[PDB]
Amino acid sequence: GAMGSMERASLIQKAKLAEQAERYEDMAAFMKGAVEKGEELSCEERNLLSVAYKNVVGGQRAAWRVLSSIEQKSNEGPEVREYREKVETELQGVCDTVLGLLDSHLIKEAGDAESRVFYLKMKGDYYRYLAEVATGDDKKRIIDSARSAYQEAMDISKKEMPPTNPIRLGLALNFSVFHYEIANSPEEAISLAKTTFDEAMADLHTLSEDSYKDSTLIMQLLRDNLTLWT
C-alpha cells in the first residue's frame, strides 16, 4: 500500500479535492488507500470510490473502443493491435483492482442493504467491463460472474428497498444494459426497464420533492434506453 502512511481522513479529503481538479486517477488511488485502511465505507465514501473508478475505466473504455474500431477497419503493421492490447490490459488491471477491493473485503463486511446492493452492483459493472473486451475461454465465465452479481443485488434490492430507491433504479438500469449489450437478451433488457419504470412511477407519490427529483432523473435514463430499444 503506497497510501499506507496517509490518514484515512486525509485520503478522503484528497479524493474530494482530486474530483474537483478532475484528477480521477489520483482520486481512485486515494480511495483505494482509504478502502485498504480496513474500515467500512459510509454512503458518501462509497460514492467517491465509485465515481473515481468509473471515470478511470470510462476513459480506458472510450480509448479501447476507438482503437478496436481502427483495428477492425484495418482487418477489412502490428501497431494498432499492439496498442489496443496495451490499453485493454490496463483496463483489465483497473477492473481487477476494483474487484479485488470488493472481494477484500468490502462485500463480506457489508450487512446493510444499501451498502451490499451498492457493492454487488459495482461487482456486476466491473465484470461487465471485463466482458466488453473478453474473447475466449473465460468470456462465458466473465459474463456469468456479472450476471450473478447483478442478480444477487437485484434480489436484495427487491426485498429491502422501495422501487424508487436510486441505487435500486441504477442497478436495474445497468442490469438491463447488461442484458442488451452483453447477454444478447434485448427482450429481457426491455422487460426489466419497463417493469422498473412502472413500479417506480407508482411509488413517486410517497417521495419528498428532493427524492422525487433523484428518482425521476434515473427513470428518464430507463425511458431513454426504451426509446432507443423499441
Binding site: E44, S50, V51, D125, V177, Y180, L221, N225
Partner: peptide
C-alpha cells in the same frame, strides 16, 4: 444504450 453515467459525486 446508456448505463448510469456515475461520473460526478
Amino acid at each position: 444504450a446508456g448505463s448510469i453515467p456515475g461520473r460526478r459525486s
